[PDB]
Amino acid sequence: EKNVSIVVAASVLSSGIGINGQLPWSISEDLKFFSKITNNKCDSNKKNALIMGRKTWDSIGRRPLKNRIIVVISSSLPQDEADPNVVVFRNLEDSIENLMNDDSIENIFVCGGESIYRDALKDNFVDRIYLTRVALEDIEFDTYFPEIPETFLPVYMSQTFCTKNISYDFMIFEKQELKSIDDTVDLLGEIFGIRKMGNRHKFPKEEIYNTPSIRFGREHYEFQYLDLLSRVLENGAYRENRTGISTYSIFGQMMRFDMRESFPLLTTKKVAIRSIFEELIWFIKGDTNGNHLIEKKVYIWSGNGSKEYLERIGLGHREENDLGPIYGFQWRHYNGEYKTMHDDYTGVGVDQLAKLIETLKNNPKDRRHILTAWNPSALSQMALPPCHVLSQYYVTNDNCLSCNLYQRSCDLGLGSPFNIASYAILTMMLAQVCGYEPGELAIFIGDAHIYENHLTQLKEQLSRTPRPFPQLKFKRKVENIEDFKWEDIELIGYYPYPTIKMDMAV
Amino acid sequence: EKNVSIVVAASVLSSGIGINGQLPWSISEDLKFFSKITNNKCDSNKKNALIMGRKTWDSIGRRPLKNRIIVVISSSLPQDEADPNVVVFRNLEDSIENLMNDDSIENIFVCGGESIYRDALKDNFVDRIYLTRVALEDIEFDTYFPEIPETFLPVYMSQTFCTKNISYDFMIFEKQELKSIDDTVDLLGEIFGIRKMGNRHKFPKEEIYNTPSIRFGREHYEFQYLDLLSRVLENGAYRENRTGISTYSIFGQMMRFDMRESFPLLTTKKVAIRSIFEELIWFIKGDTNGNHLIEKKVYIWSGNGSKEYLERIGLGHREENDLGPIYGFQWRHYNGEYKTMHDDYTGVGVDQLAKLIETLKNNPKDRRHILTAWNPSALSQMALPPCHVLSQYYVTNDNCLSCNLYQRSCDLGLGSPFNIASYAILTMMLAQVCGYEPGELAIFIGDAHIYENHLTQLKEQLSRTPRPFPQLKFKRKVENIEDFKWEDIELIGYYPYPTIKMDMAV
Ligand SMILES: NC(=O)C1=CN([C@@H]2O[C@H](COP(=O)(O)OP(=O)(O)OC[C@H]3O[C@@H](n4cnc5c(N)ncnc54)[C@H](OP(=O)(O)O)[C@@H]3O)[C@@H](O)[C@H]2O)C=CC1
Ligand SMILES: NC(=O)C1=CN([C@@H]2O[C@H](COP(=O)(O)OP(=O)(O)OC[C@H]3O[C@@H](n4cnc5c(N)ncnc54)[C@H](OP(=O)(O)O)[C@@H]3O)[C@@H](O)[C@H]2O)C=CC1
Ligand SMILES: CN(Cc1cnc2nc(N)nc(N)c2n1)c1ccc(C(=O)N[C@@H](CCC(=O)O)C(=O)O)cc1
Ligand SMILES: CN(Cc1cnc2nc(N)nc(N)c2n1)c1ccc(C(=O)N[C@@H](CCC(=O)O)C(=O)O)cc1
Ligand SMILES: Nc1nc2[nH]cc(Cc3ccc(C(=O)Nc4cc(Cl)ccc4C(=O)O)cc3)c2c(=O)[nH]1
Ligand SMILES: Nc1nc2[nH]cc(Cc3ccc(C(=O)Nc4cc(Cl)ccc4C(=O)O)cc3)c2c(=O)[nH]1
Ligand SMILES: O=c1[nH]c(=O)n([C@H]2C[C@H](O)[C@@H](COP(=O)(O)O)O2)cc1F
Ligand SMILES: O=c1[nH]c(=O)n([C@H]2C[C@H](O)[C@@H](COP(=O)(O)O)O2)cc1F
């Protein structure tokens, strides 16, 4: 009785694994994973057995794999004994003679063939599944990996990797069958109530935890966002705010996202990437005219720019969509005297963005690459004080650009998915203009909250297992950061779950 | 063969446990801990046995403990059989007859008496040690808990708790006498190099990890600082900076500290608490004259305010120790035009601190309690740009005041211990003035680094197991936050390791 594992690489939506006798992709790192996972063993005087169908045996050229024994399932192949590295069996059950005897075989791997995969799962021979999810869907397949039966549960999901602009990750599924420290912490939590800080940061219950069977392998960085939702649902205090809609709120949180091997665009929900880009280039250009976004069919700033809202907050003198000195006016004209959105501000104020770009490439190891929007002198004139308040940038020794952001207030349902993608694009833009590669993104949050009219929606999103992040590439090298257009951006391999409608609190 | 555990409460330095036949303190929560840990059992048809010396039996009034069986070690007590809840043995070894039979005894606890403790450890009867460390030292003891033998290793250390201004924590010692996920992550780290983000955040090696035997019980929040040192030693990139002293640096980190039950003043090193307060009240008053700190024998700002340094950074026109508009000038006079440190600035600029105090008590649930010091218009005039750049404050539903801080650059050897205690005091001051209690402290860091001339010192500090945090209380209620004096502060129960000298990089 030894272990039997499936190794397979399948597409993210339809589970395609083959086409015309070969693979529908060419990913070198995935073959290295197959090699390392099938060679891994404890006893040096034993070998691992790789079971595969005859058509897969043809596709690998009918040549042996070093250090391993290949088991071919075939009805017509001659049961040859000349090659000790290749053995032939007439059916899959008989090949499980690797179990019944042969103590020189340590582990068994079901290595390919839809027919072999389907029979191994149908007869309940498989203990573990190593799955490489490939983000390629609008191509032709003729061979599929069968649906994983309900007896299996995921226990690991890696970060997203990139090869030739193709996104992929690695997952492990398993077939389902000291206390002294945990007891002491429980007893201390009964004695001290909320006096014990751990009781103020309770671990989320299973019913609000995304894919709960993945306990020690939540490596995919979309869990950084999903688990923050779970923490708010678990520990969030019911609080009122300036809007009529109350929230559940906690204070002091963070999220990390990689940007070297993928782009952090959420997959558990279709995110309006075009509106995100249009808002960001609107910031970069220094613009505060809300009509320019509406003219581009972007209405995210409509609520905080209506005549009724502006009059209510004491800005009735202002034009309809004149939002005042907000993001993009502090970026390009910090401390500049604001009049209206139609005036000419060329030369007024401190151009933070221009100075940031120059210091990033003239003094990369400088510890002061800072862009701020919190101006106490201008807060009263803003339609809304800045939420993403301050950001810092860092040039690594291997010429990557990382970004930290402090956010004072985080609408997790609507604002947060935008903020993650927004500063990811901005860091990539700064990276290209300064001649670096994208690095890492960290977001530090003050008031992280969920509006109570988003509870049904966000619990729906928490029921969806994440998929690998897509890739985002620029189609050309711009001469100035203001020259970026929506046509220059290419989003590769984005296969999200359907859209989830959520209303904005004015 | 069942478990034998010691339960004891001893003072943090000298391990005193008794005086004149009674305890040297009165801590209710510790008695409840003793009750819960000695009653904890699995089988409802079994009981736990509590072994104690005769003098301890006298000190508890010679009355039984509910649901448990007391085993008294005595040479003269009559071996009575009337009470089935109290049994008498003539020596400690014979009383371990609880093991040899009596299947109604599930667990065994050695519950007190220096004579009983010393014999239980000397004869190697003990498997586990439950230790309550009490921060009371300059009092009289006549009974001591023996030194824990080297066969034991700590596995848990709780946060600091407070009873009647007495600090204490709980520790567990043990006599130290699936792999599929870990293997897959290792294999993925061999294929992808620094392309896998986990390889850029490697777990610290044991030789640079403070108290490595505590793996799953690093609850004491001083580990938030110590483990950040370890992360920098493990993954820090060697980088140059404006000073002549290079650092090892990482980007994007955080630390959390409780403030309800203790004050986060590091114990692995004696911290100059008076210099911290004197600098903070210097900020609150709006002062930028460096001589006022030197006149109070505080020299932390001397290096960045000397004639040689000021001339070197292009501020040769300034008087000696005229630091310019820095912390406390942006706090009280944001955007105010700075001339020299001798001028009258009453009324100029935005008084952020005054507006913060007013909003904290008139609109507590407001999500904009923000204090910033990053002024792009004034950076060129500063002797040093702000390190602690922005802070946000939060009023919980149970009337506690929490604080978030973003720090762009963190000297972990010298600056970081100061920043932790500084913003803890400030949040406590704001809490008293606004009528709240202290909450939690979170510090988010950009460039966290260690200067290379601090490596020997910080590795020395990493060899010291932390002690419970002290308490900090105010002796009077001030009418204005500016009225706080050093005499108003009481530091209770601070027993740190000796001072560690480290030079500042100019
Ligand atoms: N992405 C991935 O991870 C992988 C993809 N692939 C791809 O999948 C395709 C191949 O898979 P597939 O089309 O299903 O072919 P198979 O690899 O499953 O091979 C099928 C052959 O196996 C033999 N066989 C299967 N079942 C039995 C049985 N019950 N009794 C006796 N013999 C049996 C038969 O050989 P015979 O006719 O001689 O009797 C059959 O023709 C290729 O394109 C390949 O590249 C393959 C492996 C992995
Ligand atoms: N902080 C804490 O966790 C605890 C503190 N304490 C404190 O410690 C003090 C008491 O401890 P301590 O002074 O050491 O007294 P003990 O509790 O250890 O009791 C001593 C008595 O136990 C009997 N005894 C001990 N060893 C032997 C032996 N080898 N053979 C036979 N009998 C033995 C003797 O009784 P006899 O003379 O009858 O023969 C001896 O006088 C008190 O002040 C108490 O408050 C006590 C428990 C816990
Ligand atoms: C057609 N085929 C089946 C195949 C292909 N990709 C997969 N990918 C995954 N993730 N899992 C599988 N079971 C899998 N199977 C192949 C193709 C190549 C090799 C192969 O060359 N393996 C070498 C790998 C050489 C390398 O280092 O690049 C080895 O040493 O194992 C094996 C099976
Ligand atoms: C004098 N003495 C010895 C004593 C006191 N404090 C300790 N504290 C610790 N952490 N460990 C010990 N072994 C210990 N022993 C005592 C004192 C009171 C009780 C006691 O009353 N226990 C009650 C609890 C009373 C309550 O809940 O407060 C129980 O039911 O266990 C036991 C032992
Ligand atoms: N409380 C609060 N006030 C805000 N003021 C300004 C913002 C910024 C802001 C405002 C609205 C939206 C928004 O609807 N996004 C969308 C979400 C989904 Cl799920 C689908 C489509 C859109 C879309 O619009 O294409 C995103 C950001 C904002 C915010 O996010 N929250
Ligand atoms: N690189 C850099 N520049 C700085 N400018 C301004 C600061 C702020 C700053 C400056 C100096 C010290 C400092 O010596 N603390 C001490 C440390 C120990 Cl271990 C013992 C005594 C003292 C003491 O002095 O009583 C603490 C903070 C600071 C800093 O910490 N690092
Ligand atoms: O980029 C944004 N991110 C964000 O989270 N909000 C939300 C946070 C909060 O729910 C709401 C109001 O901010 P506040 O009430 O704190 O002034 O705006 C708004 C943005 F524009
Ligand atoms: O409160 C402080 N905290 C701190 O960490 N530094 C250190 C950080 C850095 O090592 C040094 C210089 O900052 P920088 O060269 O990035 O401008 O000051 C200085 C302070 F005053």
Beta strands in B176-217 (DSSP E): none
Token pair 């075009």 is found at A274
Q: In what order do the strands lie in the sheet with B237-239?
A: B237-239, B247-258, B437-451, B400-411, B388-395, B370-372
- Measuring CA to CA, which residue among A420, A433, A412 is closest to residue A488? A433
- Measuring CA to CA, which residue among A498, A396, A495, A504 is closest to residue A12? A495
Q: Is the minimum distance from the CB of A244 to ligand 7 under 6 angstroms?
A: no
Label residue B502 exposed, middle or buried (CB < 10 Å: 0-12, 13-18, 19+). Answer: middle
Helices B179-191 and A28-39: crossing angle in degrees, nearest 10, is 140
Interface contact A181-B155, CB threshold 8 A: yes
The residue type found at B145 is F
Query: Which pairs count as long-range contacts for B352-359, CB under 8 Å and 24+ apart, including other chains?
Result: B352/A376, B353/B284, B353/B481, B355/A376, B356/B393, B356/B430, B357/B430, B357/B433, B357/B434, B357/B481
Kindly identify the ligand whose nearest atom is closest to the C-alpha of B55.
Answer: 2
- Whether B217 and B345 share a structural domain: no
Ligand 2 proximal residues by C-beta, below 6 Å: B 8-9, 17-18, 21-23, 53-56, 59, 73-77, 90-91, 112-116, 119, 143
C-beta separation of A269 from A467 below 8 A: no
**Beta bridge mates, A381:** none
- Whether A213 and A255 share a structural domain: no
* Helix, strand, coil percentages, rounded to 5, for chain A: 30, 25, 45
Q: To which H or E segment does residue B239 belong?
A: strand B237-239
- Whether B42 and B8 share a structural domain: yes
- Whether A352 and A447 share a structural domain: yes
C-beta separation of A429 from A262 below 8 A: no
Residues of A in contact with B197 (CB under 8 A): 159, 221, 256, 258, 260-261, 440
Q: How far apart are CA A361 and CA A430, in angstroms?
A: 10
**Beta bridge mates, B132:** B9, B170
Ligand 6 proximal residues by C-beta, below 6 Å: B 272, 275, 300-301, 304, 384, 411, 414-415, 418, 499-500, 502, 504-505
| Option in B36, B184, B372 nearest A374 (CB) | B372
| Residue A452: how many other CB atoms lie within 10 Å | 14
Domain containing A189 equals: 177-222
Say what the alpha-carbon torsion angle B19, B21, B25, B27 is, to the nearest 10 degrees. Answer: 150
**Domain count within chain A:** 3
C-beta separation of A503 from A303 below 8 A: no
C-beta separation of B445 from B459 below 8 A: no
Kindly report the nearest CA distance between residue B318 and chain A, in angstroms.
Answer: 23
- Whether A162 and A99 share a structural domain: yes
Q: How far apart are CA B414 and CA B243, in angstroms?
A: 15
Instruction: Tell me the best of B229, B241, B300, B327 to mutate to test the pocket of ligand 6, counting ligand atoms within 8 Å of each CB and taking the most.
Output: B300
With b for 16 or more beta-carbon neighbours within 10 A and e for fewer, the B143-178 pattern comes to bbbeebeeebbbbbbbbbbbeeebbbbbbbbbbeee
- Whether B134 and B240 share a structural domain: no
- Whether A334 and A452 share a structural domain: yes
- Sign of the CA dihedral A410, A412, A414, A418? positive
- Whether B129 and B153 share a structural domain: yes
Token pair 């860092």 is found at A394
Any alpha helices (H) in B82-165, and if so which ranges? 92-95, 97-100, 114-122
Q: Is the minimum distance from the CB of B30 to ligand 4 under 6 angstroms?
A: yes
- Sign of the CA dihedral B316, B317, B320, B325? negative
Q: Is the minimum distance from the CB of B8 to ligand 4 under 6 angstroms?
A: yes
Q: How far apart are CA A489 and CA A327, in angstroms?
A: 22
Q: Decide which of A222, A255, A280 is a domain's last residue.
A: A222
- Sign of the CA dihedral A84, A86, A87, A88? negative
Kindly report the nearest CA distance between residue B397 and chain A, in angstroms.
Answer: 7
Token pair 């506690």 is found at B400
CA angle A295, A298, A299 (to 5 degrees): 105
Token pair 């209710």 is found at B28
Which tokens go with B406? Answer: 């973003």
Residue B218, SS3 per DSSP: strand
Residues of A in contact with B444 (CB under 8 A): 254, 404, 406, 444
C-beta separation of B214 from B220 below 8 A: no
- Measuring CA to CA, which residue among B444, B443, B449, B401 is closest to residue B426? B401
Q: How far apart are CA A469 and CA A461, in angstroms?
A: 16
Residues of B in contact with A36 (CB under 8 A): 187, 190-191
C-beta separation of B293 from B286 below 8 A: no
Token pair 């913003």 is found at B423
CATH value at residue A206: 3.30.572.10
Q: What is the DSSP string of A286-331?
A: T--BTHHHHHTT--TTSGGGSHHHHHHTT-TTS-TTB--S-TTTTT
- Whether B404 and B371 share a structural domain: yes
Q: Is the minimum distance from the CB of A241 to ligand 7 under 6 angstroms?
A: yes
Residue B87, SS3 per DSSP: strand
Q: How far apart are CA B269 and CA B265, in angstroms?
A: 9
C-beta separation of A24 from A18 below 8 A: yes
Question: Would you mind telling me the total number of residues written for chain A in this entry?
Answer: 506
Method of determination is: X-ray
Instruction: Tell me the best of A298, A323, A409, A445 to mutate to test the pocket of ligand 7, counting ligand atoms within 8 Å of each CB and taking the most.
Output: A409
SS (H, E, C) A66-83: CCCEEEEECCCCCCCCCC
C-beta separation of B51 from B506 below 8 A: no
Instruction: Tell me the best of A300, A409, A420, A449 to mutate to test the pocket of ligand 5, counting ligand atoms within 8 Å of each CB and taking the most.
Output: A300
Q: Decide which of B176, B191, B207 is a domain's last residue.
A: B176
Q: To which H or E segment does residue A112 belong?
A: none
Token pair 């061979």 is found at A143
* Pairing between β-strand B69-73 and β-strand A471-474 as defined by DSSP bridges: unpaired
B16 CA distance to ligand 4 centroid (A)? Answer: 16
* Pairing between β-strand A143-144 and β-strand A16-18 as defined by DSSP bridges: antiparallel
CB proximity list for A284: less than 8 A, separation 6 or greater: A328, A331, A353, A426, A429, A481, A482, A484
C-beta separation of B421 from A473 below 8 A: no
C-beta separation of A448 from A397 below 8 A: no
- Whether B494 and B376 share a structural domain: yes
Catalytic residue among B111, B162, B387, B403: B387
Which tokens go with A234? Answer: 């678990």
Q: How far is CA B100 from CA A234, B71, B128, in A?
A: 47, 15, 19
- Whether B8 and B110 share a structural domain: yes
CB proximity list for B211: less than 8 A, separation 6 or greater: B154, B157, B465, B466
C-beta separation of B213 from B429 below 8 A: no
| Option in B128, B251, B377 nearest A335 (CB) | B377
Q: What is the resolution of this structure in A?
A: 2.5
* Pairing between β-strand B143-144 and β-strand B47-53 as defined by DSSP bridges: unpaired
Q: Is the minimum distance from the CB of A16 to ligand 1 under 6 angstroms?
A: no
- Whether B316 and B331 share a structural domain: yes
- Sign of the CA dihedral B397, B402, B405, B411? negative
CATH value at residue B151: 3.40.430.10
Specify whether B387 is catalytic.
yes
Label residue A477 exposed, middle or buried (CB < 10 Å: 0-12, 13-18, 19+). Answer: exposed
Nearest CA to ligand 6 atom 12: B300
Which tokens go with B88? Answer: 């008498």
Kindly report the nearest CA distance between residue B361 and chain A, in angstroms.
Answer: 15
